[PDB]
Symmetry: C3
């Protein structure tokens, strides 16, 4: 019954000349995020480190071994370290905030990737999608934000 909660936040700029990868899914778009800059996976990664009280993603996977590694590999490495700390992942919930493109047709693909990387049943992983209602830098489409929550148990 030694439960712990963690929360995660990430945001990246939307720029031309980059692929758009969210939840490990390459989504056809005129711009991508400036890592593979996978905003969803980084937020989930941070939430997991947070729940296990192991610091944050920048400390574990800096700009100094993990060069060229995609965010799915970083998530798998995160999960491994959480497990070595003696914690089991119970569930993950998340929200992506993007004005465009449409993300709903890609939700299930994202869930399956995350579930596989965390060795979780599909019914313990959730991904939600929101616009920012044309408000702020998100609403003007300058970037994409992700929020995450994770529950673990020792």
């Amino acid at each position: 019954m030694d439960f712990r909660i963690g929360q995660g936040y990430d945001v990246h700029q939307l720029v031309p000349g980059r692929p758009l990868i969210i939840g490990g899914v390459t989504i056809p778009y005129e711009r991508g995020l400036l890592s593979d800059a996978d905003v969803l996976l980084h937020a989930i990664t941070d939430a997991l480190f947070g729940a296990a009280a192991l610091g944050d993603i920048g400390r574990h996977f800096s700009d100094t071994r993990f060069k060229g590694a995609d965010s799915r590999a970083l998530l798998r490495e995160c999960a491994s370290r959480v497990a070595q700390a003696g914690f089991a992942i119970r569930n993950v919930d998340s929200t992506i905030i993007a004005q465009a493109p449409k993300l709903a047709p890609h939700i299930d693909a994202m869930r399956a990737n995350i579930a596989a990387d965390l060795d979780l049943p599909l019914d313990r992983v959730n991904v939600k999608a929101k616009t920012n209602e044309k408000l702020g830098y998100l609403g003007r489409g300058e970037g994409i934000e992700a929020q995450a929550a994770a529950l673990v148990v020792r």
Copy 2:
């Protein structure tokens, strides 16, 4: 036992001509929130949190933005239906916490009413429901009064 956590987020534009409804409370104000339904930013975030905890997807999947029945829909009715589907999935709600962010109007006089509405809708005692009011300290679009944001967290358990 089988606990699950969920988180929710929502934001709506503030515009003339619309009623301002937050946490089911109609608040006297010259502007209101713009959306397909009554645009109740707080109830939508709580809703998303509850679907999220139960891994049922999100508010848009369950109550489509493109349906004339949900045009001007009572978000309290949406919250109650959400709660019903979470229960059908086999989950009991343990607690909800939430934040509302607005430059204006003052929301503190209405927090108790919001909490009561949420508690009733979810069939929870008052001490399992919390709503916190904030400003954005004059920063960004929220500081410029362009819209209102809500954040929510919910804990459930698979019965």
Copy 3:
């Protein structure tokens, strides 16, 4: 068991010439956070997350610096019959570098809450040069807290 979760949010403008205090740690900087108190954005967010979890409202409902207020928050939480299990948090700041001060923050929080270090976590992020946070006009903090009655 009667677990409860809470979530906290806070943001303050960066102005001259106030000192920069985050997680009870004074950090050398040309600007500092503007508020009625010491404007400790991290501690305010944690404080609200804890009041949220115990359903005791928020900070601007009950009430000395932010550390004293966090200590008072912990008192009211225990009074209501709750024990704190863990806190997680994120500071969003484009500048200055927060990594060197993270473990001191965490020490402060653990002491004020009477928790061992391994139940307290603080994470730092930039805003990738986006918005008011990206232009260094303010600093935001987010927090989550798990309690049990």
